[PDB]
Amino acid sequence: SLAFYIATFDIGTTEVKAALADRDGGLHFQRSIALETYGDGNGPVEQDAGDWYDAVQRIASSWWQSGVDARRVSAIVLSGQMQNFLPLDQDHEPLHRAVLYSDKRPLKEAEEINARHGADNLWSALENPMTAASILPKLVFWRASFPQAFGRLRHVVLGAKDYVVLRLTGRHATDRTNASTTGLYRPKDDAWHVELLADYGFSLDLMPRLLEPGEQVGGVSALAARQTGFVSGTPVLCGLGDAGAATLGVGVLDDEDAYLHLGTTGWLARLTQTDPVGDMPVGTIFRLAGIIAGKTLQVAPVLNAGNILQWALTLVGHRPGEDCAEYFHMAAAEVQGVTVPDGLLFVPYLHAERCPVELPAPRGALLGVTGATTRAQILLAVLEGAALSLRWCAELLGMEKVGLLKVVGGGARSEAWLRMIADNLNVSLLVKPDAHLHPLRGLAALAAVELEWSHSIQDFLREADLRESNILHPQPCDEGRRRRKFERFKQCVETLGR
Template sequence: MKFIASFDIGTTNVKGLLVNRDGGLSYEHNVPLALRQEPQRIEQEPGQWFQAVAAIAAEWFRGGVHPQEIGLISFSGQMQDCIPVGGKMEALRPAILYSDSRAGEEAARIIEELGADSIRQAVENRMDGTLTFPKILWLHRHERELYNQTVSFLISSKDYVIAQLTGRFVTDPTSASTTGCMNIRTRSWTQEWFRRLGLDSGKMPAILRADEIAGTVHAAAARQTGFAEGTPVLCGIGDAGAATLGAGVYRPEELYAYIGTTGWIASAAARPADSGTGIFNLAYVEPGRYINIAPLMNAGNAHQWALELFCGEASEGSSPYDEMERLIGAADRRSSEVIFLPYLNGERCPVQDEHASGCYIGIRPSTSRQDMAAAVLEGVALAMKQMLGLGAREAAPGRLTLIGGGAGSRVWCQIIADIFQTEVSVPSESQFLPCLGAALLGFRQAGWGGEYQDLTGLLRTARQCEVFSPDPAIAEHYQGKFEKFLKLYPALRPVF
């Protein structure tokens, strides 16, 4: 075996690459995805996930890679989805994505029936309408015929692709942690809850270890993708788990931040954190290991909104992204008083309010486009800083590892360093680290490595990083903005 093929199936694109036994990355490819958005409703067609994986594989084989050189396929994927699949492995409707909050009434019914304390003791997370369990109940109430036709409700985008490749319905404990119906300690479905709510627990996928082989590529999938028939396919891991592995974070109290379409600040832990603060607890790759994650509903999506608003028509020879970098780079960040609340899709942490919205505060006649664009990225960074105080860590770490597509914005990295007043370390090819994390799951199967603690340690020492140092001259200004930022949501909550 020469390569492990690894895919990260996100919201806006699918990334794929090949990883060798030294952790080297090659043949990176990226396929964009389409999204359907309405107020409180965000959906995606699952078929395009599989099509994107097949398109990336086709590029590899056209580029000279032989299917037999790929000895294993692994996945990372967006979690907390609700993907109803029928008996012929077909998606019965568009997937209801993690950021879709239509099932608020169903979440309230679940809490009334089961009790908030019993829910928290089992799953170690608060129940809300973005979780998969309330979404399944929503389908049972509003699309009953489709519910009855469903053979399995899948949780992660990668679960759907694995089903297409192997014919099996599986998920991993990290993804299952986002459903609201898995006992996080036993890593099993809370079957009694389904019975009490009139639902069928038999429609849930099998929970396998992330590094367990889910099945092999069957003949039809081999014809569609070009992978060799019989190639083993791992169960894989939800995107937050893959990102944590890719960031080299495995030991308790190690910390990193991720900026994708959504974002988070997360640390590895030996026990679940208090979910009452808004922190989300995930089962990690091995039993007895957890990820304490403070999730942001609004991160890269806020950047994209600002880009389209301020840089929708880039100058000739320049991309909107480059134009955005120049625009914010020209802002006077040392004096601007504009503050942006980044709650474009509501928020889950540290604010727990699906009705919260984005807004600007402090606009004056002198306010420029540059100031307003910069304020959007500052707003996300200020929300990230607010989340540091939710757990045991009250202050910024000596160095913050930053990964995800948002880390490709150098001006954003500098803003985060200045607001946190700490060094920000961005690994090279940061956007592909979830793919690398998913690939690490296969190293034992391939005979390429042993313990995850050792593998993540090698990642940290071997990778190249760009480091952004904070500007102490702007520290007092940003501290003042942060103190105002903390007051804004409580003051505006009645308006929302």
């Protein structure tokens, strides 16, 4: 016999990762192409969409030239950045650089939209945040500044991998998981928010068609075949937003499954059965549809995360231009066998925050310092404080029934932090290494089901897994005492607001 593969891609924020997936869950011919970002962190966060496809071309070229036969690639499926704004003309050419999710320039427009429609009405219909990062504001903001370009507007792409899917098949579509993030989509009606788009003079024709991740969008076109070297007619599946693929990739499949992304920034996620939406949160809470039939990923986005620890390296003598390796090492060494006093408390919002609280301005403090306070206790309180933010998020997400938390990211390198998190959230943790491959595993599994390589996604992931860890469980604690420090921690955030 001969090997067949699924071409998997992630169009991520800083790079494009790819691999050819065999039926046994093996990921081969792994590739990585770096993408540039524009804006220098002064407000704008943009990319040239062509770079994404350019990246896909380069990877496919490198595959054929590495002896891979494009006919043995039985399907193409991608994940990528969610919540983009990308305006295209009639020939599918960008009218503007892609504006990324982290761009939040349109403050006044989001304010207006919320005022005009009612925040409770919008929340009630979208089940998600309407903020400066949402697509409607970015679209309004753009129409006003570029009226000519706007005249030529024909399509609005809302996820990075959707553009590449467009380049490949010539059809404009997206997944419900990504749609959720946009603040343009109604989960309950399963449709774009018609009256809201019409009220601002935007046609439905601008919207992509909604598709299941496993549905075929179309086949690779003759032209795309010439551009990439894929075989014309090779199935291109819809795929899904990277949050969806990453969580699928690590086995987040069942009710009360949960996930934690601990990078420079982070997010905590709880999968559950789709329920009637509750009252507006006083903390940005996403509810992503479409990852599993009948289930919703409840996500709390965290802006102060692994960056809190990174900051604290200053405490052990780190300076602006130095490699951080030796300092993470000292910090870990120093907090060994240390205990944090009930009175010592670190509030970790060194940057503006969304969850668990809206803080447009930082609120960073070290409280309860006495003469007996050591630097080691400080370092630890930082981890504790960061973990208390996380417990706050879990409380918002309703995670009291979650048994196990899948953890990814560089943040998990702090053994001391993990311990803080398990203990304070009172949940077990399992670390999942190689976070860059996760969305690819998820995609490969959904593709495998569609190709009839496997009966289910679950079955697929569990096999690759025999291919290759000990769960970390919480120490026993004075529930009630950890709980009192937790409430005080809440009172401190409020009190620091004056």
